[PDB]
Design goal:
homodimer, 125 residues, alpha+beta, Pnp Oxidase, Chain A, 8-stranded antiparallel beta sheet, 3 helices, 51% strand, globular, unknown function, ssgcid
Chain lengths: 125, 125
Amino acid sequence: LITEMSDYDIREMIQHKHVGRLGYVVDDRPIIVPMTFRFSGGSFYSFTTDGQKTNAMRKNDAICILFDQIESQTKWRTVLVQGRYREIAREDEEEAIVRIMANEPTWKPVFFRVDIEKLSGHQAE
Amino acid sequence: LITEMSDYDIREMIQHKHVGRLGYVVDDRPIIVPMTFRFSGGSFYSFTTDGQKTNAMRKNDAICILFDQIESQTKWRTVLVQGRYREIAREDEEEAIVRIMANEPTWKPVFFRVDIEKLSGHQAE
């Protein structure tokens, strides 16, 4: 019943789905929080004004993002990005901002990107 | 802009929101997967036929569930359950099944529950 999604559908999803759910680890326990992301040049870009998220991901840089479109229990698509927290230096914030905003599909903070180590996508129909 | 949700709204949400997103840890990295849950007698009950989830949560029982209702970037509610994977013994599966199904609000597998260590809920309006 569970199938691998085509690269086409994985791409449509990570290009067009604005909100994903970020997973990080604090003291060996998982935390999940919704965040907006922009896929650009092979990484996902975001930012937060929440210093607790920033400090947690600084201490443990192993993170993930789930994107999904759930129609029912048996009709759904999920894309999981596993990778690494990479904080953007102050002098690179303008670059990050333009990447986040530039030509977005008709949709102090600390900026970061998620560099991809594994990208997987599956569906049920 | 971010407020604590009332216990009333936290309860309405974990009673009526069928799908949450389960967080677990594999080799010090976070994984997130959508699952259906039932809140009953202070724990969340679910099951999976996916042996990789089962084995992962057996090896590391620190897990979480996010429930959320996101209207926009500035209008949303999130409830995070942090707790422990507790696998249901075969002889307790019928109990688990009746708990999952009994009087549900008009909505071999290995059964499990999530026992709650922290429950928090926040909103933005």
